[PDB]
Amino acid sequence: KVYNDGYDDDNYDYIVKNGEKWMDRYEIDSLIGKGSFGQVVKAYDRVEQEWVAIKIIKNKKAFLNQAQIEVRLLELMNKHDTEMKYYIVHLKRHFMFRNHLCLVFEMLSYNLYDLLRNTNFRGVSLNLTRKFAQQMCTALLFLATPELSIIHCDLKPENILLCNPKRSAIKIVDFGSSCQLGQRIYQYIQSRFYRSPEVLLGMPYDLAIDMWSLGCILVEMHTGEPLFSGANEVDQMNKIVEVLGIPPAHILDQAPKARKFFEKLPDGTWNLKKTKREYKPPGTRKLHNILGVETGGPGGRRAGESGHTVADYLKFKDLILRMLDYDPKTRIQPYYALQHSFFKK
Numbered sequence: 001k002v003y004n005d006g007y008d009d010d011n012y013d014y015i016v017k018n019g020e021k022w023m024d025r026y027e028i029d030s031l032i033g034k035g036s037f038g039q040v041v042k043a044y045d046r047v048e049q050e051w052v053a054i055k056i057i058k059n060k061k062a063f064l065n066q067a068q069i070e071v072r073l074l075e076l077m078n079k080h081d082t083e084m085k086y087y088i089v090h091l092k093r094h095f096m097f098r099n100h101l102c103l104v105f106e107m108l109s110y111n112l113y114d115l116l117r118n119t120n121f122r123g124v125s126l127n128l129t130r131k132f133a134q135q136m137c138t139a140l141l142f143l144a145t146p147e148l149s150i151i152h153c154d155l156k157p158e159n160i161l162l163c164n165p166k167r168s169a170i171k172i173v174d175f176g177s178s179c180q181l182g183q184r185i186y187q188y189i190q191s192r193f194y195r196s197p198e199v200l201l202g203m204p205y206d207l208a209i210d211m212w213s214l215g216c217i218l219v220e221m222h223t224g225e226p227l228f229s230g231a232n233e234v235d236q237m238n239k240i241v242e243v244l245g246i247p248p249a250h251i252l253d254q255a256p257k258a259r260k261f262f263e264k265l266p267d268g269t270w271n272l273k274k275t276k277r278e279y280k281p282p283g284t285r286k287l288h289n290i291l292g293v294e295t296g297g298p299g300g301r302r303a304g305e306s307g308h309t310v311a312d313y314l315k316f317k318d319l320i321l322r323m324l325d326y327d328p329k330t331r332i333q334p335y336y337a338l339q340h341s342f343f344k345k
Ligand SMILES: COc1ccc2c3ccnc(C(F)(F)F)c3n(CCCCN)c2c1
Pocket: 032, 033, 034, 035, 037, 040, 053, 055, 089, 105, 106, 107, 108, 109, 161, 173, 174, 175
C-alpha cells in the first residue's frame, strides 16, 4: 500500500530524503522541524545562493486550507513599506510540489526555548531580556497597524527565533494559528502558560492578548522558568491570582466562565472557589520577589553583576505589571511600551 505514488507516509507527510533536489533548484539537507501541519526542512537554494527553511504542509485539505491563511497574512504584511516588519519572519515565495504546499522562508537560528535549555533554565541577563523586549514591542506595534490588526494567538519562547546564534536579533514565526481583529470565532486559544485572563474567562478579546503573553515571556527569559505553569485551566488561573490578586469585580461580573474559578459572595465581592491546602493567598507571591529586585536577582544569581542594579530591576517590574494588567482596555499598548523608562539609554 503506497500513498501519493512514492512520496507520502501513512500520515500525509512528504517522506523527506536527505540530498534530494527539487525542481532542479532546492537541495534538501535535513529535517529541522515537525508539527501537525507537517514538516520543516533546511535546504539550499542553488539559484539565489542562500539557505532557506521550507515548510512542507501535509497533503490533506484541512492543513492546506490552514496554511493558505498563513500565506495570506504574510503576503498582507509584505506589502507594507516600514522597517518594523523585519521582526516577522519573511515568506519569500510558495509553490505546490508533489501535492504539498511549500512555504519558503529565510533561514533562522534556534528559538528562545532552546536558549533557556543552554542556561539550564537559569535565565539570560537583563540586558539581553531588554533587547528581546524592545524588538517584540516593535513587532506587536507592526501587527497593530490598522490595516493589519493581526493577533498572533500563540506567542511563546518556542515561536521566537534568533536570526544568528551569536547575536540578539529575533523574529516571530508561525502565523498558522493567527487571526485578524473582528467577530469572535475561536475561543480555546493561546498556549496554556501564556493564555490571557479574558480568554480563560470566556470574554471578548483583541490584540491585547499578545501583550499578556509577552509579559509572561519576558519574565521567563530572565528567571529561566515559566511565570504561570498551570496543569489545567483552574490551576492556571490560581497561579495568576497568586501573583496579581483577585481580578476586579467589574470584569468578573461579565465573565461567562467566572464561576469556573470564582464565586460571588452575598455582599457582591468575589473569592476563589474552595476545590489538601495548596495555593498561596491572593496576591502574596509578589513579582518583586520573583525577580529578586532587592535580593540580587532570581535565586540571588545576579548578585554582583553589572546591569542588574535595583533601579534597573524596578523599571522592569513596572513595565511587566503594565503588560499583566487584568483589564485589556488599560493594559499597556506597543506604542507606549516602547516609551517606558526601561528602554531609555
Ligand atoms: C530555522 O528557521 C525557521 C524559519 C522559519 C520558520 C517557520 C515559519 C512558520 N512556521 C514554522 C513552524 F514552527 F514550523 F510552524 C517555522 N519554523 C519552525 C520552527 C523551528 C522549531 N520547529 C521555522 C524555522
